[PDB]
RNA sequence: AAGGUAAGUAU
C-alpha cells in the first residue's frame, strides 16, 4: 500500500497456458524444420 | 498410378533395364491396388515429366511378374529400385536396407533429389550413393 | 531384433 507504506496483498504469478502452448509449438516448429538444418542453427533457435 | 508404362513379363523388365544407357531406370515393384503402391505411384507420376531427361519410370506387378521376388527380396507392399546401365545402383537411405525404397514417399522433391543423386553417382561409376536425406527417423514432431 | 553392408577388380 503506497499511502501507508505497508504490504497488503500478494500477487501469485503464473505462466499462462496459452503462452505455454505457444512455446511448445515454437519448439515443435524448430524440431520439424531440422532435416537439413545444422546443429548450430537448431541450438541457436532454441536459445533465442 | 495407371498413367505410367507397365512391364508384363520378366523379359520386358530386363529389356527396359538394358535399353536405357543414359537414364536411370526407376522400376516400382508392387501392385497397382496396394494403397502404399498407390501413394508411391502418384508421387512417381507427379515427377515423371520432370525427370524424363535423366530418368525413366516403369511399374511392375510382382504377381504378374514374379521373376524377381526371390532375387530382389520383393516381399514388401511397395518397392522402388534404381538401375543404371544394367547395374543395380544401391542407395544409402539410412534405413538399413541399401538396395531399395520399400516405403511410400510424400514429397515430389524428395524423390527427385534421390533420383538425381542416383543418376550422378551412377554416371561417376559408383554402385552406392548416399541419400541427401536420412530415413532412420520419420522426423515427426 | 534392427535403424552399424563401402562399391569394386583380381586369385
Curated annotation (Swiss-Prot), chain A:
Domain of life: Eukaryota
Cellular compartment(s): Nucleus; Nucleus speckle
Transmembrane regions listed in the UniProt entry: none
Tissue specificity of this protein: Widely expressed.
Disease tied to this protein: Retinitis pigmentosa 13: A retinal dystrophy belonging to the group of pigmentary retinopathies. Retinitis pigmentosa is characterized by retinal pigment deposits visible on fundus examination and primary loss of rod photoreceptor cells followed by secondary loss of cone photoreceptors. Patients typically have night vision blindness and loss of midperipheral visual field. As their condition progresses, they lose their far peripheral visual field and eventually central vision as well.
Subunit structure and binding partners: Part of the U5 snRNP complex. Component of the U4/U6-U5 tri-snRNP complex composed of the U4, U6 and U5 snRNAs and at least PRPF3, PRPF4, PRPF6, PRPF8, PRPF31, SNRNP200, TXNL4A, SNRNP40, DDX23, CD2BP2, PPIH, SNU13, EFTUD2, SART1 and USP39. Component of the U5.U4atac/U6atac snRNP complexes in U12-dependent spliceosomes. Within the minor spliceosome, which acts on U12-type introns, interacts with PPIL2 and RBM48. Core component of U2-type precatalytic, catalytic and postcatalytic spliceosomal complexes. Found in a mRNA splicing-dependent exon junction complex (EJC) with SRRM1.
Function: Plays a role in pre-mRNA splicing as core component of precatalytic, catalytic and postcatalytic spliceosomal complexes, both of the predominant U2-type spliceosome and the minor U12-type spliceosome. Functions as a scaffold that mediates the ordered assembly of spliceosomal proteins and snRNAs. Required for the assembly of the U4/U6-U5 tri-snRNP complex, a building block of the spliceosome. Functions as a scaffold that positions spliceosomal U2, U5 and U6 snRNAs at splice sites on pre-mRNA substrates, so that splicing can occur. Interacts with both the 5' and the 3' splice site.
Domain notes: The MPN (JAB/Mov34) domain mediates interaction with TSSC4 and SNRNP200. Has structural similarity with deubiquitinating enzymes, but lacks the residues that would bind the catalytic metal ion.
Protein name per its UniProtKB record: Pre-mRNA-processing-splicing factor 8
Organism from which the protein derives: Homo sapiens (Human)
Gene: PRPF8
Shown chain mapped onto the complete sequence: 1218 to 1265 of 2335
From Swiss-Prot, chain B:
Function: Plays a role in pre-mRNA splicing as component of the U5 snRNP and U4/U6-U5 tri-snRNP complexes that are involved in spliceosome assembly, and as component of the precatalytic spliceosome (spliceosome B complex).
Record-linked SUPFAM superfamilies: Thioredoxin-like (SSF52833)
Result of changing residue 37 to A: Viable when expressed in S.pombe
GO BP, sorted A to Z: cell division; mRNA splicing, via spliceosome; RNA splicing, via transesterification reactions; spliceosomal complex assembly
This protein's name: Thioredoxin-like protein 4A
Localization: Nucleus
UniProt entry keywords in alphabetical sequence: Cell cycle, Cell division, Deafness, Disulfide bond, Mitosis, mRNA processing, mRNA splicing, Nucleus, Phosphoprotein, Spliceosome
Pfam families attached to this UniProt entry: DIM1
